[PDB]
Design an enzyme around this catalytic site. Sequence first.
Site, short mmCIF file in Angstrom:
data_model
loop_
_atom_site.label_atom_id
_atom_site.label_comp_id
_atom_site.label_asym_id
_atom_site.label_seq_id
_atom_site.Cartn_x
_atom_site.Cartn_y
_atom_site.Cartn_z
N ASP A 184 0.44 5.30 0.60
CA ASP A 184 -0.24 6.84 0.42
C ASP A 184 0.63 8.12 0.74
OD1 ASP A 184 -2.06 4.71 1.92
OD2 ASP A 184 -1.01 5.13 3.72
N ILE B 59 5.99 4.66 1.11
CA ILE B 59 5.31 3.20 1.29
C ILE B 59 5.00 2.65 2.62
CG2 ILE B 59 7.39 1.95 1.52
CD1 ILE B 59 6.44 -0.85 -0.19
N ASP B 60 3.79 2.29 2.84
CA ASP B 60 3.47 1.56 4.62
C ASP B 60 4.20 0.21 4.25
OD1 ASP B 60 1.33 0.27 3.05
OD2 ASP B 60 0.49 2.65 3.50
N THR B 61 5.27 0.00 5.39
CA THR B 61 5.34 -1.41 6.03
C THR B 61 4.73 -1.42 6.78
OG1 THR B 61 7.57 -2.70 7.18
CG2 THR B 61 7.87 -0.22 6.91
N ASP C 4 1.27 -1.03 -0.38
CA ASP C 4 -0.08 -0.14 -0.06
C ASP C 4 1.03 1.21 0.34
OD1 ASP C 4 -1.77 2.13 0.80
OD2 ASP C 4 -3.24 0.69 1.90
#
Lengths: 231, 224, 337, 113
Positions: free
Chosen positions: C72, C169-171, C70
């Site tokens: 954002d 990026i969302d980890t 994902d």
Amino acid sequence: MDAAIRGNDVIFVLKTIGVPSACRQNEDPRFVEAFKCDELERYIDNNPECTLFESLRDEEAYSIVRIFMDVDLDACLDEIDYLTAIQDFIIEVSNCVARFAFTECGAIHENVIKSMRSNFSLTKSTNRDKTSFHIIFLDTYTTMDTLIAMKRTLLELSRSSENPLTRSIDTAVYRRKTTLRVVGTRKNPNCDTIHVMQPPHDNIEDYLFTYVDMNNNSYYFSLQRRLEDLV
Amino acid sequence: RLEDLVPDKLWEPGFISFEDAIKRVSKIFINSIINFNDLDENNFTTVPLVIDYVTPCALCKKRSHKHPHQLSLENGAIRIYKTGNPHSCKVKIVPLDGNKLFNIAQRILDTNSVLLTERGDHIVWINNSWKFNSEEPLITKLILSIRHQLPKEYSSELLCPRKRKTVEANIRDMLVDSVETDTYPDKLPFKNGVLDLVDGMFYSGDDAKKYTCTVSTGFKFDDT
Amino acid sequence: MDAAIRGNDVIFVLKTIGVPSACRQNEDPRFVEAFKCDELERYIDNNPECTLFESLRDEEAYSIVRIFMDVDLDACLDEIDYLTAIQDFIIEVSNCVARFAFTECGAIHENVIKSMRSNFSLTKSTNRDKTSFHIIFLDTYTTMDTLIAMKRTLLELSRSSENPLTRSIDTAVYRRKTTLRVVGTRKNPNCDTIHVMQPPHDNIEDYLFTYVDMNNNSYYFSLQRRLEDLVPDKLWEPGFISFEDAIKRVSKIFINSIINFNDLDENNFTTVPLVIDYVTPCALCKKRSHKHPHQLSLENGAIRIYKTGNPHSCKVKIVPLDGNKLFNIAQRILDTN
Amino acid sequence: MDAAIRGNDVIFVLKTIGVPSACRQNEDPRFVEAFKCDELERYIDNNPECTLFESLRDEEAYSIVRIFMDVDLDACLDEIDYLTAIQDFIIEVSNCVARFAFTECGAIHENVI
Ligand SMILES: Nc1ncnc2c1ncn2[C@@H]1O[C@H](COP(=O)(O)OP(=O)(O)OP(=O)(O)O)[C@@H](O)[C@H]1O
């Protein structure tokens, strides 16, 4: 600009929080007194459990005071981080105060910066859980009215930073007829946390924001406009 | 009423949405919160987070911790501290006010390195001398040069050209009052300071800055 | 390598957000349900405002999952700018995880690169306030623990990359019992913003990272060791600056010569005291000499230089070791005059 | 002062610590529910392992609540010292609340005690 305007050797302190105004006006010896630097040291030594509250004796008669601040962080801080935090704190505060002193006070921007980062007085609380102190700038004199107008930008500075010391700035102290607890006394007779001194400054004269003594390295600035046009 | 009691709340308007605010906290903990589903806008300052420790903690660099962490709200920013022994873990602060590059522009503005002249040019202060240009403004060069005199978390953010452009655009929107130049007639501005004439001493650095001298001799001063 | 892991076509879904952990193990109809893709599609149509959150049934049963992520973005941009950014972002992420696969997974580098760059699926949030979309490669399979262990290298790439997508990026989604919202459903019963399909993929089966179907053109890899065996990296991190450049910068501020310049390596610089002789006044405190040597310490991405013993006597200097990559290129092009 | 200010006997109780905000406003039966006193007694006996949390339904409408305190002492105390401690505890908390009520609330100092 007479002789009395370049000197103020009289200290006006309280002895209890929430003193009523009438008791302040009548200058009764039970609540308020006058003092000298040497005499105040004797009074504290004779009363190891007293409680004093430094304040301005008269507002309209005398407004020139030293620049002072307050910090109250509710967490212990390691020494190396503490030194790192305090370097940035002086850097950011010096720039912000000087910037306002140039854009709405008509003073030299670079003159203020040199006078503040040069000589400043730092205290430290005796509590081991939280870290608090009273940083007082020595060679920067201004009127109480200027500091009141200084409140809005200081609040913006404290709210918009990351350094914990400068984010915990107490902006509520700046008001009319302010009170600052003197170094070496308690808050209430039940409190066991007091403020002690720090090197290299040892004489008590270096910790009262009402003491006006302008030497060669001192600088002064005040608001040109008054507080009534500022809607 | 509360107006006379305190002008303070737990979540004043203008702050970011709570779910977004927690997202930022979850970023600082590189590990995953186990009891994440116990948080809402009413108990996040009371419920302790039971973190799991697969990798070393991002706040104290220790392998694992004895006790769960705990949040606290203050002055428009939620603080992270560890219960138990306070000295075991460091203190980390998550802001909520706004963006970061506007703060950078503010900080560059307080140090009084950019000024507005009558002719409309923006003079900067780099290499101990005021410089200016018309076809190519020097604001970005000043930003990159003054990068060093800012805290660590602000310095690394100041390398991408787009972000420097954004900071410059923010700076140009704060200068509204013009300042005159060259009002001292008995000073000789050099490329690395200004040589005073009334007494022969040669200032440099911060001291040689209040004399707003625009034109300069173009070469450095050699006191030897 | 039995058929059980060769086929997993049972979708497990959740209804409400923040589902209590006290009911998932009981599998209450009111919170959880099992479905097939065809049965999933009709349920979506029958309930227009239903909120669904896909989750993995049991960690010890089928840990194999597709490679998903994902991103954002907190602003809006042009459509061509999306096209050029997403292509570079896809290329950059392919390089990093392939290197990780060749490093800690024992997989063929070119095989991994070829497998994902061939086919991929894309979504898009209709929320124009902030853009955020999912990307799911179809022909790359790995276990849950592999993504958990690689959580660190993804974070490093996001900090020191170029594309706005890879910068955000969302980890955090890589966790235990992770939840991914199915495409086309609301997040809360009040917000109508949903994820919409994108061309050319239309089938729902190609939008879920739990629907595992090993065909003959897909690659799979996994960690060899167990999860509770990872050893952290050394005092250094291989992403900012080589060691000699950093030491030289430390050497440049010290006007005096460092006598012990040769014993500092990539691991002992945080413990060896910097015993210096002050032929000139100290570059920090401007003093004649000092009782104790200085020291080095790495923290947050800098070298906090300080003197041990009585730290309050000498000032503290911080060396900003940058992690950018093009700035080093610019510096190298400059210093050659 | 009306019956709304003179009566509140409906109990609004949550079902899990930290209920999401997007559902408390909608009063989802899966997370929150309103009950009467009698039905509260039946529900707890019906479910052997329920988890409940009483709260206030509408803050700005009915803000009138009783006085409550909580004590968490992580140390064993004998009953005899427990008996003498709780009485003096009530002694101390009585004076503290009474002082402020006479100070900033105008309440009758003897009446509050
Ligand atoms: N640290 C965490 N631990 C557990 N669950 C988490 C954590 N962080 C986020 N979540 C869950 O992930 C959800 C993500 O919702 P979010 O508001 O980010 O939606 P989005 O931006 O539309 O995208 P997406 O749902 O695909 O992430 C949250 O609602 C929450 O349920």
